[PDB]
Design a protein around this motif. Structure first.
Motif: not given
Lengths: 358, 138, 358
Positions: A341-343, A93, A21-22, A286, A335, A323, A19, A319-321, A25
């Protein structure tokens, strides 16, 4: 104080280096010791092993920073210092600010004593601060069989419609934000970056007044095509739009801009340029998720990379951003958590740039 | 140059200068039983405020409590904490104060233990170690 | 001067000579005490016999270092000066390094003056002054037979089960564990580290209802598989499944979301995926050793380079930060310190994503 009762837990645990170097640094320690105490606190438990005072007294005495730091005269004073080893957090913190005191003081005392430089090259000192001081449910989607599909646009979503070259991405904007301004008072704005916003005004007026074959991109028409003009601008001025072509932008613009364009416009969607220019491409997506969550309206930013989710990847992150990733060959909306979700592809006319659903 | 426990005893004369239902359980826990020679009467002036019912604050209390107990309890208010307190910070100072006495139980009897040193006794004087080393193992 | 800390622990154990008399000798001690101390500290083992300071207080008073050590004061004040009892090795090493100093002095000092002595011999002086230096327990898996021939899955474990790019480490965590959170109540805090959770929620449900091979990415499902999806939809979002996907960081995303939930859900496992592009390795790998120490429960950490220990022995701590290192070729074993050495086999399909039993 916030430091003069810290190190005890790292003996009381003693494996309380995680906790530390959580969020931190080895540098967040002015006092000449704590820093290379913590540097001697890392590579030791970097084995290994885990931790105990003695193993700390090792590499410090090794780097003879016990002739250079002082000696054991602190070990007993810090083993006997912490009256409860559950603060920890905390205290990492709350002691952040203590060394965070000077994150923008280094990067500001600079420019002040560096008026004594750019004089010369003047302007440039803008971008040192930019990179040292700085750091229908719904307001309608696009189509009615695409507003009984996924359903939107709803409260707060980052969107990317990774649009193909060769085939097209022009009329998609002339069919996601062409009629949504000209019907209900949740108005919009149009980002057209790399090109002047005004060449893009031969695209939707020639697609709202159905007049683009005589032609409306080069001067005086034959005494005829002055016919269906009453449908082009006759609805696109009783709404509220800010079309755009302001410089090779970063993204903190639409943060300061959108702090006074949420209060400047009416807001239903915010149509930003394709995700492959603004800069260095991945970072932009992002910080494009949060943008739908500020002005309280979903925000759009397309792309110019098959088409699937692994080609905006050969130039980005996403991807992670984002959705909900729709596409253009075919709006491959593949997604979400909402369900549908469709074609689906749509027909085209290209004498008027028209989309067709059935 | 204040040691380890002196502040864990202070993990009370500040956690009950600002929260008294975080002080009623001390009656149950640290009677006491307290460690320091002037820190017993301080507690004796804490619980007695809980009965009459008036405006309880950091500095309204510390005047009851005439003189000396202010360049002391005021310096008990020049501190750096908050009122977000755990269940295993409440189960922590349970040992802290009341058991610092047991750290003493390896000093006054060592005077005797070390006086068996002067008579060259190492037959039986080398046993009180178990009634020390394996006495701290609880 | 580790010696002081090196001698006073054979009381705390007291058999803190189990490794201490399996390591060095009395010579390393400079002072005539510590040597003849450890020399008479090495006569016990003849039976033997066993361990007590008194067995040495009838030993250094017998061979009179009674008047030749530091007196009574210095004898007990060794029990009184060593705290961290789990070291020993260790520990005693720095002295051999103080003796590594000694391993050089009365070797080199001999030779340095040999240009004033063996003048003379030289080739003799050479090859000699050189040849001197020539020295169930057992948190679940679903296929119950897999918390057995190894025995969990238990408190404080860096359970690594690795494989090559998209072979086992990719979806292995979506198999065994979905029987510790969905089946028994020992919840989680997950991190998708080869994709966003939008793609890591689209890989585990494939196992239930015999679904996702027609597929869902392109289209939908067939009539009876909706009446088999509705039999596979409510064991993920509803379930105590709470993944995290956050982009390029060090390690803090775990602990910034895995400290508040210590008291709330319960924490029975902590989940980790792929490694080699989260921005060397051990400062991210030891960030999980003293974590399962602080939060106290079994944890899964799937790394990347065969996998043997050797090929992940240079791209990760792994051998050290984890005694336990299973693999994904079968779940190949390597180093276990919790159960018997029984090996197992469950066959893998590679489509519907299921490691179905033998």
């Amino acid at each position: 104080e916030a430091e003069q009762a810290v190190l005890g837990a790292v003996f009381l645990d003693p494996a309380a280096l995680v906790p530390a170097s959580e969020i931190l640094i080895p540098e967040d320690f002015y006092r000449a010791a704590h820093q290379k105490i913590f540097h001697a606190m890392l590579r030791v438990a970097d084995r290994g092993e885990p931790v105990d005072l003695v193993t700390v007294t090792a590499e410090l005495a090794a780097s003879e920073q016990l002739e250079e730091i002082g000696g054991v005269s602190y070990l007993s004073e810090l083993a006997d210092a912490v009256p409860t080893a559950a603060n920890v957090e905390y205290y990492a913190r709350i002691v952040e600010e203590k060394s965070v005191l000077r994150r923008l003081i280094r990067t500001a005392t600079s420019i002040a004593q560096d008026g004594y430089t750019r004089e010369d090259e003047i302007d440039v000192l803008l971008d040192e601060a930019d990179r040292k001081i700085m750091e229908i449910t719904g307001i309608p989607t696009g189509f009615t069989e695409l507003d009984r599909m996924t359903s939107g646009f709803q409260r707060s979503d980052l969107i990317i419609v990774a649009a193909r070259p060769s085939v097209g991405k022009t009329a998609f904007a002339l069919n996601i934000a062409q009629n949504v301004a000209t019907k209900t008072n949740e108005n919009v704005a149009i980002f057209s970056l790399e090109m002047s916003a005004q060449q893009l005004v031969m695209r939707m007026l020639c697609a709202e007044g159905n007049i683009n074959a005589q032609n409306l991109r080069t001067g005086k028409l034959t005494p005829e095509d002055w016919g269906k003009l009453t449908m082009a601008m006759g609805s696109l001025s009783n709404a509220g739009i800010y079309i755009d072509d302001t410089p090779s932008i970063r993204v903190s613009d639409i943060r300061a801009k959108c702090r006074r364009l949420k209060q400047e416009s009416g807001l239903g969607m915010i149509v930003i340029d394709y995700l492959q220019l603004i800069q260095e491409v991945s970072e932009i997506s992002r910080s494009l998720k949060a943008l739908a969550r500020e002005l309280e309206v979903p925000v759009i930013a397309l792309s110019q990379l098959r088409p699937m989710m692994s080609d905006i990847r050969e130039s980005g992150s996403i991807e992670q951003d984002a959705d909900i990733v729709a596409f253009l060959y075919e709006i491959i909306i593949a997604k979400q958590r909402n369900g549908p979700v469709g074609t689906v592809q749509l027909a085209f006319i290209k004498e008027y740039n028209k989309f067709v659903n059935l | 140059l204040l040691p380890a426990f002196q502040n864990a005893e202070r993990l009370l004369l500040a956690h009950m200068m600002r929260s008294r239902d975080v002080a009623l359980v001390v009656q149950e826990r640290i009677g006491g039983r307290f460690n320091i020679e002037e820190h017993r009467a301080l507690a004796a002036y804490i619980y007695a405020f809980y009965e009459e019912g008036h405006e309880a604050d950091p500095g309204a209390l510390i005047s009851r409590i005439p003189g000396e107990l202010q360049p002391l309890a005021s310096e008990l208010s020049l501190l750096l904490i908050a009122d977000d307190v755990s269940e295993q910070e409440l189960e922590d100072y349970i040992r802290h104060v009341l058991n610092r006495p047991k750290w003493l139980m390896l000093k006054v009897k060592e005077q005797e233990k070390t006086e068996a040193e002067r008579r060259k006794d190492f037959l039986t004087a080398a046993r009180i170690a178990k009634e020390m080393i394996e006495m701290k193992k609880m």
